[PDB]
Amino acid sequence: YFQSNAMAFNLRNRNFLKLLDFSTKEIQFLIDLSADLKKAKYAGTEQKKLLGKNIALIFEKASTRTRCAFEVAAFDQGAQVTYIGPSGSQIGDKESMKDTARVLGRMYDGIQYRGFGQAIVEELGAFAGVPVWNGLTDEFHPTQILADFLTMLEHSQGKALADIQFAYLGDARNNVGNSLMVGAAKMGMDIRLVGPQAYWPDEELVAACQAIAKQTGGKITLTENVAEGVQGCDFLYTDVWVSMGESPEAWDERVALMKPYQVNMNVLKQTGNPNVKFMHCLPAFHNDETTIGKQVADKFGMKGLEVTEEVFESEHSIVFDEAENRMHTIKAVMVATLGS
Amino acid sequence: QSNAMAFNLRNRNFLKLLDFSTKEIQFLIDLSADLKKAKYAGTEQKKLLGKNIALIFEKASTRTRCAFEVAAFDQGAQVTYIGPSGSQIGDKESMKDTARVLGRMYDGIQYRGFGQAIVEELGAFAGVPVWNGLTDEFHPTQILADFLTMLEHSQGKALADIQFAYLGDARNNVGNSLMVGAAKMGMDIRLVGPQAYWPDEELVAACQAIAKQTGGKITLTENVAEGVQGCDFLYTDVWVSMGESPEAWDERVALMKPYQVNMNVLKQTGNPNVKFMHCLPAFHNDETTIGKQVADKFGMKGLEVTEEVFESEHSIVFDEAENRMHTIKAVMVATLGS
Amino acid sequence: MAFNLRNRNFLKLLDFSTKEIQFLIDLSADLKKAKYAGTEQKKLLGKNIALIFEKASTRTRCAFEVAAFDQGAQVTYIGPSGSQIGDKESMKDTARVLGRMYDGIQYRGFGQAIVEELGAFAGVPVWNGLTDEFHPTQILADFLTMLEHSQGKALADIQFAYLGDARNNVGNSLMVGAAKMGMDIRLVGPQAYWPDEELVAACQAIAKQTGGKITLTENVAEGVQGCDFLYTDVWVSMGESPEAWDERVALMKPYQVNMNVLKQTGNPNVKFMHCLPAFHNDETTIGKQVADKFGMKGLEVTEEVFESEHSIVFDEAENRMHTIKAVMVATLGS
C-alpha cells in the first residue's frame, strides 16, 4: 500500500541551501532517513549509496563538528572528499564564486559550502550544476537543525515534533536562531525566542515563519521575559553570543545585554519541568578551558558565558548526542540528494 | 607504437615538457581522451589501486589540487594534501631530505611551488615519480589540458595544423610552457606582449631548434593586430603571477592593458570561429577582492579579459578546466599505473 | 597478548610492559614484510580515524595517513588552523565529539596532560604522535631500525648514545625505552639539559629489573666508547623559544655529531641515527640563519656524517610508518 519512492524521486539532485526551500514532508523524510542510517551503521548493515562519488568541502570559516560529520558520512557511504580550508585556495581573493562553482561542478559530484553571505551559497547552488549543501552561512544553519530535531525526537517518549515545546535563549538573530525558527514553523512546533529585543530575528523572516506556522499549527513567541518564555519547555537551547565572522568588539556590546539569558540551573527550574533537556549546537563557552572563553569571562567576572558548567555537564545536557547526530543527518542529506 | 610510448613512460617524472618527445606528448593527450571517455561511460579501470600519493603545495591552488585529488580517487589511489603551512618543508627540512622521506612512504609525489630547481631536486632524490603541478618557470599539466581542449574544439585538425596566440606576460610559467608545447607539436604560436616580458632568449633559442624539426613556427611581437590575424585560439593569463610582489601591479597594468583580450581583439583575428582560452583563475570583473581593487585603481571593468569575451560563446575556459583532471590522470596512469 | 592491547590508548611507553613493546616491534616487522611482499591484510577496513596536529609535521602525519590507507581506513587531518580546538572548544569537549564520530584519534601537540585528557574522555583509542614530554611512536621505529641493522642481536645486547638535549621528548622516550628493553644507553650532553631526576630514577628502577644500564655524562669520549649507534636531534624543539638558540648553541656545540665523534666510538660499524628533521647544512631557512649567526656549517650533525655510509636516517624514517601501523592494528584492528 504505502511503500513509495515519489518523495525520494523529488529529493534527487536538489541542493540543501536552507529549510525554507523544503516542505514539511521533505524535512520529515530527511529526519526518518537519518534514523535509518544511524541504525544501519550501529547494526553493521549500512549500504554504500555514494560509491565512487567525489565531494568537495569548502570551508571559508573554521569547523570541527560540521567538517568531520561531512567527512565521516562520505567515508561510510563509499565517497571520497577534498577538504578546502580557509587558506590555500583561490576562492574569493583570486577567483569569483561563479567561476569556482563551474570548475568544481565539472570535477566533483557534490559540493558543501560553509562561509559568509547566504547569497554566496545561493550563487554556488545556481552555477555548480551538481548538488550543493549549506554547512553554515551568516543567515542559516540547516544541517544543524535537522540534527537537533532528530535529537529531540529521540529524547522524547511518544511525541512527534508537532507536540514539542522549546526555547532558544540569547542571540536570536544568528544563523542557528533563524534556522530553529524556520524549522519549528515548518514542523508545527512551539518555539519561544527569548533574548534582548535588539537581537530578535528580522521582521520579514518572522512574518514569513508566522505565515508558515499558521498552516502547520506551530506557534512562535518572541519575548524578553525568561520565566514566561521557558515555562513548560521540553528543551532549552542556546549558542555563543558572538558568532564567527563578527568583530571581537561585539563582546563589549553584548555581554551585559545577554547575561540575564544565561542558561543556568535557575533557568531550568523556571521551566517547572523536571524532565527538561539542555541543547547547544557547540562549540560552547562554559568554563575557562578555551582561550576566548576564559578571557571574556575573566573580563566580566563570570565563570561560563551562555551556559554554566553545572548545566552543561548535568544529566539534563544532551549536547554530545546532538553532536553525533550531525553526522547521521548530513549523511541523510547526501544520500537523498546524490545517492544512487 | 602507442604500446612503445606507454612502455617508455613508466616510472618517469613529469617535470617539464622539455623532458618528453613529440610522440610521448601525443600519447599522453590520446590517453587523456581515452580516460575521459571511460569515466563518462562508467568503464574506467583503476590502475592506481592501493597506491598512495603525496600532494605538496607551496602556493595556493583550486583547479590543480582538485584535479590531482579527483584523478587519484577515480583511479583507486589515496592522497595526502600538504599545504603551504603545517609541514616541516623549507623552514625546518631541506627538499633533499623531504624527498627521501616521502619517497619511502608514498608511490608518487606532486609538487607546486617556486623555482624549477626545487622540483628538479625533488625529482632527483625521491626515487618515485614526481609531477610538476606548477613552478615559476613551467606549468606542464596545464598545456596538456590546453592541447586536448584545442583538439576537441577543432574539426579534424591535428595540433600541427593549429595557429594560436598568447597575450600578455609571455615569460610567465604558462607562456613558457605554451611555447615549448607548440614547438614540440609543430604548431604556429604567436607570443604577443611587451618586449620586456618576452620569454628568455635561451628558452626561445631551444624552442626554435625544436620547431625546425617539427615544422612549428614561433613569432614574438608587440603588435596585437599582427600577432592574432588568422588565429584559431586566443589565450591569456593574469598579468602578475603568484609569488611576485603585489607591488608589481602598480606599474604593470598600464603596460599590459593594450594586450587585454576584448571583442576588438577577437575581431582582429578575421576568424568567426575563433575560440578563447585562459588557464584560470581570471580577473574578468569586480567579483574578486584583488580583481576589483586593481581594476578600480585604473577605472577598468576587467583586466586581462573582459566579461563580454569570457562569458561569450567563443569562450571554452570551463571545458579547458575540466580537461585538467583528465590530463593529470593520464600523467599519473602512464608513469605509475599498472 | 594481542587481546590485551585491544582498545588501549598509546600515550607513552611507561604505560606498557617489556613484552608488549616487543610484540609491537615484532608486529611492525611482520606488517613491513607483508607490504613488501604484497600480501598485506586490511584489518582497519571501514574504520575512520582523526589526526589532530597542533604542531607541524611531515613524517608523523604521513606515516599515520599511509598506514591507515594501506589498512583500509580513512583519515581526517585537522591541522593547527581551521578547527575550533583550543581557542573556541575545550579538549574535553573535542574528545567527546570526535569519539562519537571516529574509531580512533591521533594527537600531536603540547603538554602530555592534554593527550592524557583526550585519552580519558574520547572513549576510543588515542595515540600520542608527539608531546613536549614524550614521543613514543618514534622510539618504536628506532628500535625496529636498530634490530634490522644489527646482526642477530636482541635489543638487550645493544649499546647506544644520545647526544645533545637529553631532556627533550625524544631523549626522555629513548631513556624509558632503553630501560624497558634492557639496553645500555648513554645520555651525553650538558648537565643542565639532562632529564628530570624523577624520570631518571623511575627508569633506573625499571632497568634494574631488565638488566639495562643508564649513564648520564658530559664527557663525549666516555659516553660514546663502544656504541653500536649514535643518535641526536635538534637542540631546540618545536614550541620552545627561538631565543633558546642564544642560550644553547655554545653549550651544545661540543656535542655535535661529527666524524671525530664517530671515531671516538672505536667502532668501524657504528651507525648514525636522527629522528629528523635535521639541521645539517644551509638548505633550510632556520638552519641557515642559526648556523650563519654562530659561524657553523651544520648544527647537531655535520653534512659529512648525515650523508655518510654510516647514516641510516632514511631507513629509520620509513620505519615510522610500519610501527604506527602496528600500533593502530594492535589497538583497533579486527
Ligand SMILES: NC(=O)NCCC[C@H](N)C(=O)O
Ligand atoms: N555546530 C555548529 O555547526 N556550530 C557552529 C557555530 C555557530 C555559531 N552561531 C556561529 O555562526 O559561530
Ligand SMILES: NC(=O)NCCC[C@H](N)C(=O)O
Ligand atoms: N590553471 C592553473 O593551474 N593556474 C595557476 C596560475 C598560473 C599563473 N601564471 C601563476 O603562476 O600565478
Ligand SMILES: NC(=O)NCCC[C@H](N)C(=O)O
Ligand atoms: N621525527 C619526528 O617526529 N620528529 C619530530 C620533532 C621532534 C623534536 N624533538 C621536536 O619536538 O621538535
Ligand SMILES: [Cl-]
Ligand atoms: Cl535553514
Ligand SMILES: [Cl-]
Ligand atoms: Cl613545460
Ligand SMILES: [Cl-]
Ligand atoms: Cl614514551
